[PDB]
């Protein structure tokens, strides 16, 4: 029992911190591990935490703070404030660690990626439509994506015109007792 | 993107941040397969050594959840956040 570094003396038995291990950047060597840590964490704390909790030796630690955008309390209403900043730490490992490659879109069915992709597309269109309106503009009728109701009225139009179908008056427009 | 991969040690401490060593996150159907939290009455029958050890078992579990939540969004794997908020 001997750590590669000099341990402190203030013992912490029940820490309430949440450490997040994030994927590295593409061109980063395999001896750099990036973590999201509490804003009150310091470089010495990460070294002790990684060794005594996960048994991971590090030769050096890098730390940088990420600021959050100023926002209104209720989005579009309320006083202007700024959320707490985020702190990321990059530890230099003694043993390399490589992350797996993200699954292919065809293999993400265990997460219901199909339904998630449809919902994501609809959300992207909604934010795009709002952006067009925020510019003081509208989508002309010529550029509306033809929906399934439009495709159905164009098919019938060809049937009545060709003679395949004979037009008849409606029968479910209103339920009158007279039926005339 | 075509170099021979290095041999990462199997007993690496950083493997404790992952649920599955192929997909950092766990499938939602398997992430919900868990029991309930301990009741104070059940914890009153445990010593400091157990409560001290049990505490850290909850810490490493929380760190494992946060690590999965971050990758699931960055990599756009799909759903699973609602299942993780209950587990957390």
């Amino acid at each position: 029992r001997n750590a590669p570094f000099r341990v402190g003396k203030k013992q912490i038995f029940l820490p309430n911190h949440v450490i997040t291990f994030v994927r590295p950047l593409p061109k980063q060597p395999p001896n750099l591990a990036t973590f999201i840590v509490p804003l009150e964490f310091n470089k010495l704390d990460l070294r002790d935490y990684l060794y005594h909790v996960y048994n991971v030796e590090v030769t050096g630690v890098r730390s940088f703070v990420n600021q959050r955008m100023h926002e209104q309390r209720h989005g579009d209403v309320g006083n202007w404030r700024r959320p707490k900043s985020q702190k990321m730490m990059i530890a230099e490992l003694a043993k390399p660690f490589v992350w797996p490659k993200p699954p292919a879109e065809d293999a993400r069915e265990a997460f219901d990626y199909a339904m998630w992709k449809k919902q994501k597309t609809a959300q992207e269109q909604d934010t795009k439509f709002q952006g067009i309106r925020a510019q003081g503009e509208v989508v002309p009728p010529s550029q509306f994506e033809v929906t399934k109701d439009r495709k159905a009225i164009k098919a019938r139009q060809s049937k009545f015109l060709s003679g395949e179908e004979t037009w008849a008056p409606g029968k479910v427009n209103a339920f009158l007792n007279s039926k005339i | 993107e075509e170099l021979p991969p290095i041999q990462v040690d199997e007993n690496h401490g950083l493997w404790d941040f992952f649920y599955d060593r192929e997909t950092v996150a766990m499938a939602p159907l398997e992430h919900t397969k868990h029991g309930r939290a301990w009741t104070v009455s059940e914890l009153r029958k445990k010593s400091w050594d157990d409560l001290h050890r049990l505490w850290w078992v909850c810490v490493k579990e929380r760190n494992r959840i946060a690590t999965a939540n971050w990758e699931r969004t960055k990599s756009e794997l799909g759903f699973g956040l609602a299942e993780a908020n209950e587990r957390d």
Partner: peptide, 29 residues
Amino acid sequence: WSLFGWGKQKVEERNKVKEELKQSELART
């Protein structure tokens, strides 16, 4: 079924809404 109240649910709740639409499609045939 709202666009925003669709992702904040679990696959359990979401899969039951898909099962309801499936039995509805079978009844129409």
